[PDB]
Amino acid sequence: LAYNTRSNRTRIIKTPGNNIRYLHIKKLGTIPRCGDTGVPLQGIPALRPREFARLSHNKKTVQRAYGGCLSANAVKDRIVRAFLIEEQKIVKQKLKQ
Amino acid sequence: PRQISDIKQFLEIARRKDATSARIKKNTNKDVKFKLRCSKYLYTLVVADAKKAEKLRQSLPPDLTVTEVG
Amino acid sequence: KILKPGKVALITRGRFAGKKVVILQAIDQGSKSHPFGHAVVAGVERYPLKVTKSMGAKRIARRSRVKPFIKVVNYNHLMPTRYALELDNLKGLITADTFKEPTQRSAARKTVKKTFEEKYQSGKSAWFFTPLRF
Amino acid sequence: LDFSSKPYKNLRYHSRALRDVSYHPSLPLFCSGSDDGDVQVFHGRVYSDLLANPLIVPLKILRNHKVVDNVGVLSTCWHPKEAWLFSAGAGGEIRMWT
RNA sequence: GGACAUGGGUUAGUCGAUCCUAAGAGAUAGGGAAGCUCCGUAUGAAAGUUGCACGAUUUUUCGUGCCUAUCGAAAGGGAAUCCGGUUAAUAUUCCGGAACCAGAAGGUGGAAUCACGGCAACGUAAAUGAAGUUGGAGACGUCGGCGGGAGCCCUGGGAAGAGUUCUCUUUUCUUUUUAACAAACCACACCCUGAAAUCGGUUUAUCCGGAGCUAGGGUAUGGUGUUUGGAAGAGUUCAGCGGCUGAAUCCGGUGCGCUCUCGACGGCCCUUGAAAAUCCAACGGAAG
Numbered sequence A: 001l002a003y004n005t006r007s008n009r010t011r012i013i014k015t016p017g018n019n020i021r022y023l024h025i026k027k028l029g030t031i032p033r034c035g036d037t038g039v040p041l042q043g044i045p046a047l048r049p050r051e052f053a054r055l056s057h058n059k060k061t062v063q064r065a066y067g068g069c070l071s072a073n074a075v076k077d078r079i080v081r082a083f084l085i086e087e088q089k090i091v092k093q094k095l096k097q
Numbered sequence B: 001p002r003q004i005s006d007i008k009q010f011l012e013i014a015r016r017k018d019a020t021s022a023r024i025k026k027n028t029n030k031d032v033k034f035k036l037r038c039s040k041y042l043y044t045l046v047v048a049d050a051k052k053a054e055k056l057r058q059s060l061p062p063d064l065t066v067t068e069v070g
Numbered sequence C: 001k002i003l004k005p006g007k008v009a010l011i012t013r014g015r016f017a018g019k020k021v022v023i024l025q026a027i028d029q030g031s032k033s034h035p036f037g038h039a040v041v042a043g044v045e046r047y048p049l050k051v052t053k054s055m056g057a058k059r060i061a062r063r064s065r066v067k068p069f070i071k072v073v074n075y076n077h078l079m080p081t082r083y084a085l086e087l088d089n090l091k092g093l094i095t096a097d098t099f100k101e102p103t104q105r106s107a108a109r110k111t112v113k114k115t116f117e118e119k120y121q122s123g124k125s126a127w128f129f130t131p132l133r134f
Numbered sequence D: 001l002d003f004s005s006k007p008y009k010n011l012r013y014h015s016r017a018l019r020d021v022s023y024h025p026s027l028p029l030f031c032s033g034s035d036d037g038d039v040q041v042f043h044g045r046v047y048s049d050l051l052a053n054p055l056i057v058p059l060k061i062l063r064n065h066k067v068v069d070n071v072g073v074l075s076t077c078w079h080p081k082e083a084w085l086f087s088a089g090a091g092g093e094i095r096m097w098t
Numbered sequence E: 001g002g003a004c005a006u007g008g009g010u011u012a013g014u015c016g017a018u019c020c021u022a023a024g025a026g027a028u029a030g031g032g033a034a035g036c037u038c039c040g041u042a043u044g045a046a047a048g049u050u051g052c053a054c055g056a057u058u059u060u061u062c063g064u065g066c067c068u069a070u071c072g073a074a075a076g077g078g079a080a081u082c083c084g085g086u087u088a089a090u091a092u093u094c095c096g097g098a099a100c101c102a103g104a105a106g107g108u109g110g111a112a113u114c115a116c117g118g119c120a121a122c123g124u125a126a127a128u129g130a131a132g133u134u135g136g137a138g139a140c141g142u143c144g145g146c147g148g149g150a151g152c153c154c155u156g157g158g159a160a161g162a163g164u165u166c167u168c169u170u171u172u173c174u175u176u177u178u179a180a181c182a183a184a185c186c187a188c189a190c191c192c193u194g195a196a197a198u199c200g201g202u203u204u205a206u207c208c209g210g211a212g213c214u215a216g217g218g219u220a221u222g223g224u225g226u227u228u229g230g231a232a233g234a235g236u237u238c239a240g241c242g243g244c245u246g247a248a249u250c251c252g253g254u255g256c257g258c259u260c261u262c263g264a265c266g267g268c269c270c271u272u273g274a275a276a277a278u279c280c281a282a283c284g285g286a287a288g
Helices: A072-096 B007-015 B050-059 C057-064 C096-100 C102-122
Strands: A010-014 A020-024 B021-026 B032-037 B042-047 B065-067 C007-011 C019-027 C038-044 C068-074 C078-084 D018-023 D029-034 D039-045 D055-062 D073-078 D085-089 D094-097
Touching: A072 C078, B007 B032, B007 B042, B007 B050, B032 B050, B042 B050, C007 C038, C019 C068, C019 C078, C057 C102, C068 C102, C096 C102, D018 D073, D029 D073, D039 D085
Parallel strands: B021 B065
Antiparallel strands: A010 A020, B021 B032, B032 B042, C007 C019, C007 C078, C019 C038, C038 C068, D018 D029, D029 D039, D039 D055, D073 D085, D085 D094
16 A cells, blocks of 8 residues: 555564564544534543444443433533423413413 | 453353363463363463462363473 | 421432422521532432323223422422422421431332322322423 | 362352351351342351362251341341351341251 | 476465455346437336244134345455574465464353442443334545654663774774563543632633533543563574574663654634445333
8 A cells, every 4th residue: 555644653663583573553442422412422431433332331331321322411401491482481381471 | 252260150151062172381380271162262271370270180071182391 | 497398399419400390398597418508309200191081991090190309409409380289298207317218218119109109190280290390 | 269269169049148157167068148038048068189079068947037027037146066056037037946 | 598308396265366345337127229229227127136024823725914137446345463593596475483363053160030330420240122113333525833751863881793002092993682462550531529700721722611610539542651571492602612602682871863653732624524345332111
């Protein structure tokens, strides 16, 4: 593969035959990011998209509502905002009634 | 290669049909290494006292084709 | 002073997030186990499903069956609501030993589930038993 | 400890949470007391030989213990000399199982 | 002679292509043109490879509901392999040893009756999820300084051999290996207590703090490092013997060093920085 590019990221290692050889290291995985905030979620190991399948179900999602897709702070804010908006609709309906 | 530290499970995995060959290594540190070849993984066990090592030689099933140092 | 026994509130943290709970007992004075504004709250983990008269009685009972959850959470984690639910069987059953003994915890959960099923059968606290979308 | 990190065997007879487990220091017996009010007495024979796996069999299921507030047997103790069991209940009753 | 003649020589589940898309190209629908042909690319197309599901079978003549091209990258995206040995010529391909990925069914053991714990961040051997609805990875500019690691370079001893040596020179030169992979452990973002300026913490570079500081306790992410396995049985270097047998293959110290990579920042941006294949998760509660 002439004209080395970003794919050909080689690291030199010392072999047991007292020889220096280059090993191709793949790009590191990225931890999933929260949908709303955009900050990476906590508790999800950063692996490759294909390697994520091998992990167990509990190892990829946090045991909470919207866990693994929305951050806990975002989850708390979303839960609070929905309750307040529901109360406003209830308050407005009573006044309109 | 899983390093195995439990003699009893080394015995049961040897009796299980997946085991094919076993090798015994005697290093300079007077330690005995039991290497068991399985379908996918090579299980090794390090023991330090000879009498337990010899007792586990005769505890291994005779069907297993054990071999001495390489 | 907005927190009183029998008041309906919502949990905003933990695994049981967004679940409506009823304040069984207030521990706002603080405790060694929970050095904060904690209180014992019992909520519903699986809200009852819609009941159709055409469906069988066993199917209706299975749909109406609800799994309760009793835990102690901080005041900040909780979110008080105007509504309040009071039950005779839910008074005096909350104690430190109840949470301490695992067998007592299971018995308390069974009693709470039995009380909730009776309330659902009586057609009361429909808003409390109904799941909330968030 | 010489078999695996996972438990060698699993036993799930108790109808309530298993409270206490105790092994007799000399005799090859052990006991398990739970809140169900029943105590399971098992015999565990340990053999130093590698081939001989431990022989665990039930021996007795002690009953007739009071259960108070969903709590029955709280703790069990083995006699240092013979197969005698001290069982503590929630009602303040101590049963000497000779 | 790269000439001539005669034979030999290129071995892959893991390396590339194959798959995806880019700017564009391009057939189809339609419309032009006497015409060789041209325009046109979801366009006024009935545009669905078995589009999908439902049903004791419905006047044994099918009803109801839902959702609505192809080419173009051997430098972009992407499942997976290392070491030692081996040829006259081929090696991540062959030999020996050791792994990994994808898909496929049953079987065995374990787990729940649609699992628990922790205030919490979240954790664990498991812990069903239809239609329908979303979210994430892929997937994203450039520059500077700092931190981390590896290799290389430098060097102190130790060992080995070869030197030089009237004398001096514990001296001169050379070498001193651990792979993929698999195990256990090893630190900036968030949570809990807390309410702060007499401002504190702190960068090489002053950044943050009642939108909750310092401090204490946690949680996750492990870049890495520790201990092994692999593994000495291999390789290398010295001694020998006639393939065999001996030994050693060690302990450091390091630096604005060079090379490569990762982390944490700080700017400049402006035009705020490809797409798709592919994989995962959430909401949802059909069914049992």
